[PDB]
Write a protein that binds this ligand. Structure first.
Ligand SMILES: NC(=O)c1ccc[n+]([C@@H]2O[C@H](COP(=O)([O-])OP(=O)(O)OC[C@H]3O[C@@H](n4cnc5c(N)ncnc54)[C@H](O)[C@@H]3O)[C@@H](O)[C@H]2O)c1
Ligand SMILES: NC(=O)c1ccc[n+]([C@@H]2O[C@H](COP(=O)([O-])OP(=O)(O)OC[C@H]3O[C@@H](n4cnc5c(N)ncnc54)[C@H](O)[C@@H]3O)[C@@H](O)[C@H]2O)c1
Ligand SMILES: NC(=O)c1ccc[n+]([C@@H]2O[C@H](COP(=O)([O-])OP(=O)(O)OC[C@H]3O[C@@H](n4cnc5c(N)ncnc54)[C@H](O)[C@@H]3O)[C@@H](O)[C@H]2O)c1
Ligand SMILES: NC(=O)c1ccc[n+]([C@@H]2O[C@H](COP(=O)([O-])OP(=O)(O)OC[C@H]3O[C@@H](n4cnc5c(N)ncnc54)[C@H](O)[C@@H]3O)[C@@H](O)[C@H]2O)c1
Ligand SMILES: OCc1ccc(Oc2ccc(Cl)cc2Cl)c(O)c1
Ligand SMILES: OCc1ccc(Oc2ccc(Cl)cc2Cl)c(O)c1
Ligand SMILES: OCc1ccc(Oc2ccc(Cl)cc2Cl)c(O)c1
Ligand SMILES: OCc1ccc(Oc2ccc(Cl)cc2Cl)c(O)c1
Lengths: 287, 287, 287, 287
């Protein structure tokens, strides 16, 4: 009663953002979507057209309660940060107040203080090249959009959160062990993120009593996964064959964990990387 | 319903076992206590004399419910392991079916299959001596009671548990980083426990579809903690001053995490060490 | 006989770069210095003036053999990457061929193929602000100069290295555990670096048979350490008081390890973070 | 000179003990072998009959030098620990001073203080059974012989060692990640060993100025490796195909690392697990 969560990084219903939204809904948490401008209008259209009606069903009792849907770009911290090419762009020209500070302000102006924050987004222009062939521009882009965006989101959203609020992001084990196709500095971005989760936990915990953790998810066939070089088909087959738990990993499996970590039940957990991957991370040798 | 939990390692209401019991009770889980014979009688008398009535209060809306109390010694796998001296000992003479196998059979005969199992016990004859000064007997004692007991509980209880059951144990960071005062091969035992948790997640996940995880708890002033000599006041004071979250760590804080890991909501987590310690583990240098 | 090492990141003799140069010298490795342009001329002047003569003494037998000293800026991958403000800058206008590709070319043109590479440099414009107050520009700068620079150096220098060559960089435990004054995204930069060391180890090992590792050094009172917010005086006092080995950490302590990892003796070690810190990293609770 | 190393765990020339001996010999270190009584006689006869002559060749410039060969059983701390049956056993009846304390005293009486100590031994009665199926006796046997033996060697040998001495042992990644086939509580034992290495680095560093580290070696086809059942050919084949460095892992590869960690050149390293495994440990998914 009175819980609000902003979920940054929803493009459709096949990702972890949706799975997190669903499980939170089971707890009656009011959901707000942060949607990347290039895919905002298409998302809105699909929604209006009922494409997601089946995916919104929680069970016999209720449908997902989406409070709001807002364009959100993690590339830009403030209004001042947008360049001419973006201002003049087909998809952006028709929207506004989609930088991180603007979204924080706008949510606060519409619904007040919130208490749950979800970072569920990543990007890397050069993800299809291996680390050794990644440019400076490509590397920094991955860190900017996949790691720095977490820090920015915290800096701006903490002003509009209640004490004892909770924050999560999503990571991948490629930060810790070598995953060949996970290129473009995504492995690097994820390494920074897991470390940043610790440092942030210190500052937010001491200064605001706010917790932050990260979930290291197993493979899910989402939009962005399909962008990597079959990679995702391999990851999923391998996981289902060699993980300790031979079960299909679902986005709601991550969602049920996200929900717990965002609740008061996990009051004593902060700065952690929690693995939700059917135990795959524990294996050395495939058997 | 049909949720039954066996909690192995309860002697009073001051430890993590009680905190886990209270939190599980809040979710309507049936609780069965396994009590070490040296303190079983004192436990029962206190209970009967209503000495724990206060401690069983949940909401003031609700009160803890305990299905059964059973004598239990995690030193003994089967009846045939019990040495003549122990079986005739003043505190054991009067008790029956207290080995790991017998307690498994007993519970199964009385209530059928269970779906939740808690290892919440440790012991070490030589905990007061630092590692270098620990004898072979002392070290092996510590591993036998604090680590092997977990593997044995698993071997015998997996026959009385349903698929998708969950198992948790409790550990301490001294396994990964040096804590002077944590002697006797206790650090050794917790390191083995945390490694055995992975190995067992493999076997139990593939063969039985059963999860196992361990919680690395922060300092609580329990009965056993005081037996370390003072050490625990130091640990508590240090934790409350330097942890990211500066709040008093409660037994029920661990309880609610335990409860989550035991429920179906952590379906995709297995073989992990989950830290519930106000984030202290993430720190390097104090302030 | 015939070993050449390029050391990127020498400003004076109080850092780890110098300590590495010294120990390598003991093995008769030919040393080449990569010196950051802003401090190139001052370094050259001090050298010419004999300020380092005492610091170059190895022992009774010999003086350090410096093959060459070159301006080197890790901010720039190629000639194309330099902007007008830098081209027009007091200290830069008077030098050339100081981008990473130019240095690789120039060394190769002068001395041929080399077999030992050392990354011993970091920078972060906003190091004095905590992570939460660090800007995008500040964060990315730290990653650009402290982490991406390693990848670039490998991409360009592998063309001019022999099979079985070896590469190292320097890191700090702040990537793994929270160190309060280590701000500006340096903790983040170091986290990316340790992870990048793994990914690089894969690519360089499979494609070129080249090894790469990173040394996680304890505190040394160097130029850059003095830039952090007494921090370094605290770090050193604490380390000398609480590390398992109560001895002054010397730059040559790191140098002797760097030397081993750059030699054939460590033929089977790659992608590792090796701690050289008098064991400090193993402690949880100060005693 | 005055460098003397005791190597505990040698039965033939096919293990890591021999490889460590050869590498130490190359540095003019005096070698003393501690040989388990069940294979001591067979070892001596082979040696005397010149069966190891080939294996002792270093450069063809040089040949291994062995100061002494001693019967040694790491099961027994002192003479008073030896059970009547063992002392009268056919293979033990003829031997004397083979406990940890007696071998320490003996070496001290014969050669004075030593500065290098190698634990290169492990055993487990039930290694063929997976963890879940390991008995209490088997598990405790594995910890007693493979882990406790290290602590005991330390306690008794620290009296016959000089300050700035160094101690190494050998471990395997199955402590940290799951390796099916590594049964008997061997994984448990290696996890305890790796934790005890930190705890002992603390005590030994502060009280004696003595270092201790452990090497996590990749697969070598030793005598003991074949006793696991095949398991080791599998491990080797997997390692040579998937490791960053695709070259055959040799015993002397471990030897040279051991030699570095035992020398004064690793003065600032203590309590670490150093991986010498062609970088396999850093990988997540194969190709
Ligand atoms: N899918 C997997 O297998 C997997 C495994 C581990 C971790 N993850 C992580 O989970 C998170 C969610 O991704 P997903 O797997 O659900 O795929 P997804 O495509 O559903 O989610 C990624 C979202 O990030 C958004 N995004 C990209 N750039 C952005 C920017 N600059 N500003 C704002 N939004 C931007 C995209 O619109 C997209 O909706 C990611 O951080 C990913 O790294 C995914
Ligand atoms: N209290 C802390 O600070 C702390 C921190 C980390 C982990 N832990 C862990 O939590 C668990 C419980 O300890 P606690 O702190 O709650 O103290 P506690 O005394 O409340 O719990 C220990 C219980 O284990 C029982 N026990 C001991 N040996 C037994 C045997 N052979 N068979 C059956 N039962 C036996 C004892 O009777 C006792 O009731 C332990 O595993 C401990 O390692 C405690
Ligand atoms: N000193 C410590 O306590 C400590 C502890 C752990 C790690 N380290 C690491 O050791 C490495 C060496 O630093 P140090 O401690 O010897 O101090 P240092 O100042 O002697 O070395 C840092 C060098 O990096 C150079 N540099 C900065 N920006 C550069 C750029 N854009 N291009 C090229 N060079 C640039 C500087 O000129 C300087 O000489 C650093 O990576 C540091 O992070 C230091
Ligand atoms: N070979 C590998 O693949 C591998 C990989 C990682 C670690 N290791 C480790 O290396 C060490 C040596 O094993 P190895 O692979 O060289 O096989 P090995 O047979 O060459 O070494 C084992 C030696 O230990 C001796 N030993 C056993 N019990 C003893 C006791 N109670 N007292 C004294 N000596 C005893 C045996 O006689 C044998 O000579 C072990 O600790 C093992 O765990 C080996
Ligand atoms: O199965 C592993 C896996 C699949 C998808 C992932 O998400 C991304 C990967 C790359 C990029 Cl550019 C963006 C995103 Cl959202 C991910 O992190 C890990
Ligand atoms: O605050 C840290 C801490 C306190 C108590 C603990 O529990 C024990 C410690 C020693 C022994 Cl012999 C038995 C137990 Cl139950 C523990 O594991 C960690
Ligand atoms: O004692 C810990 C410590 C001291 C100095 C360090 O090096 C730097 C720190 C910050 C910046 Cl901007 C640049 C460099 Cl070279 C470092 O990494 C860690
Ligand atoms: O290739 C991995 C590997 C092979 C052999 C090993 O050594 C032993 C394994 C089991 C037992 Cl009973 C005794 C020893 Cl010496 C080991 O530790 C790891």
């Amino acid at each position: 009663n009175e819980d609000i969560c902003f979920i940054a990084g929803i493009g459709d219903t096949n990702g972890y953002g949706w799975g997190i939204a669903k499980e939170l809904s089971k707890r009656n948490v009011k959901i707000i979507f942060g949607i990347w401008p290039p895919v905002y209008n298409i998302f809105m259209k699909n929604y209006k057209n009922g494409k997601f009606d089946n995916d919104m069903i929680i069970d016999k009792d209720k449908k997902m309660n989406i409070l709001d849907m807002l364009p959100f770009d993690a590339s830009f911290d403030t209004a001042n940060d947008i360049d001419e090419e973006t201002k003049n762009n087909k998809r952006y020209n028709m929207l506004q107040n989609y930088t991180i500070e603007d979204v924080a302000n706008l949510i606060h102006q519409k619904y007040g203080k919130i208490n749950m924050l979800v970072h569920s987004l990543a990007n890397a222009k050069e993800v299809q090249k291996d680390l050794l062939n990644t440019s400076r521009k490509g590397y920094l882009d991955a860190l900017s959009k996949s790691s720095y965006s977490l820090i920015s989101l915290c800096k701006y959203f903490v002003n509009i959160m209640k004490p004892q609020s909770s924050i999560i992001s999503l990571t991948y084990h490629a930060s810790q062990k070598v995953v060949p196709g996970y290129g473009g500095g995504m492995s690097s971005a994820k390494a920074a993120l897991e470390s940043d989760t610790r440092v942030l936990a210190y500052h937010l915990g001491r200064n605001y009593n706010i917790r932050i953790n990260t979930i290291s998810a197993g493979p899910l066939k989402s939009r962005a996964a399909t962008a990597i070089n079959t990679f995702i088909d391999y990851a999923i087959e391998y996981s289902e064959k060699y993980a300790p738990l031979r079960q299909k990993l679902l986005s709601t499996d991550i969602g049920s964990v996200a929900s717990f970590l965002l609740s008061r039940e996990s009051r004593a957990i902060t700065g952690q990387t929690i693995y939700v991957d059917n135990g795959l991370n524990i294996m050395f040798l495939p058997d």
